[PDB]
Structure 1
Amino acid sequence: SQLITQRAQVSLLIRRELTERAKDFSLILDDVAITELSFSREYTAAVEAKQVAQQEAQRAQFLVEKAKQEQRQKI
């Protein structure tokens, strides 16, 4: 998770480490990119399922409120 978020300094450290490991091959370097960081499926599905429960039980609260209108209409 922090490999995602703190990727700024993760990339900085990886840059330093590869610069120190790669200076031995008679080549000169200027810049290096770390672009992507992905995970298989479950993180996004779980996030969206949590939002599913959030808005779905908001819908349940509105079913509940129509049940209130029911109390009275049916009174």
Structure 2
Amino acid sequence: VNSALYNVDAGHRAVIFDRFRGVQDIVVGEGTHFLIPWVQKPIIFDCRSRPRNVPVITGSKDLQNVNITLRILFRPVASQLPRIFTSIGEDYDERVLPSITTEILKSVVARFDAGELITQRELVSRQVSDDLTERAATFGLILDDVSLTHLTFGKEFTEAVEAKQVAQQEAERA
């Protein structure tokens, strides 16, 4: 009877595809469960906070190049797992996130200049989180964490900043 038993690991869920009723609207939790050996099959979805890394080079409100990395923790909504399986697929993350995360991050970064991007990093992250949560709710995804992990600028701009601070040190040396 091993073919009639399937195991949903911890932090996972299973959508039941039935050969005579289609995908079932109910999602089974963790543990070992019984299914009809051939009439039903399970599709296992990770109900865990999975990390996605998004390094981009975009423009600020002054259009200067900003190298910004957004790391998010995302998980599918269990109640929406059936719909997702029939709407996007098992690889919904690689179908959805590459667009919404990138566009939301770049659109938000375009609201601030370099100084604001660095010194108001928390506000930028909060706005990215708001926009990304709103956009991802329509795909049945939930965001556990939105973080701006890396934020740098162009070579010439960084040289100019270092020159400014060197000028301050030279004023001190005077």
Instruction: Calculate the TM-score normalised by the size of structure 1.
Output: 0.59
Q: Which residue of 2 aligns with 1:68?
A: none
Does the Cα contact within 8 Å between 2:129 and 2:146 map onto a contact in 1?
yes
Gap change, CA 1:23 and 1:45, over 3 Å in 2: same
Percentage identity across aligned positions?
52
In the alignment, structure 1 residue 25 sits paired with structure 2 residue 139: yes
For structure 2, which runs of at least 5 residues remain unmatched after alignment? 1-114
For structure 1, which runs of at least 5 residues remain unmatched after alignment? 62-75
- Residues 13-36 of structure 1: CA distance to partner in whole angstroms, max 9, x if unpaired? 110111001101123332222211
Q: Which residue of 2 aligns with 1:37?
A: 151
- Residues 2-52 of structure 1: CA distance to partner in whole angstroms, max 9, x if unpaired? 011111111101101110011011233322222111101123312332315
Q: Give the alignment's Cα RMSD to 1 decimal.
A: 2.6
Greater Rg over alpha carbons, structure:
1
In proportion to residue count, which structure has more helix? 1
Aligned length: 59
Q: Which residue of 2 aligns with 1:55?
A: 170
Q: Which residue of 2 aligns with 1:64?
A: none
Secondary structure at 1:25's aligned position in 2?
coil
Partners of 1:53 and 1:6 lie apart in 2 by 23
Bigger mean CA deviation after superposition, 25-34 or 11-20: 25-34
Instruction: Calculate the TM-score normalised by the size of structure 2.
Output: 0.29
Partners of 1:53 and 1:43 lie apart in 2 by 17
In proportion to residue count, which structure has more strand? 2
Bigger mean CA deviation after superposition, 12-21 or 22-31: 22-31
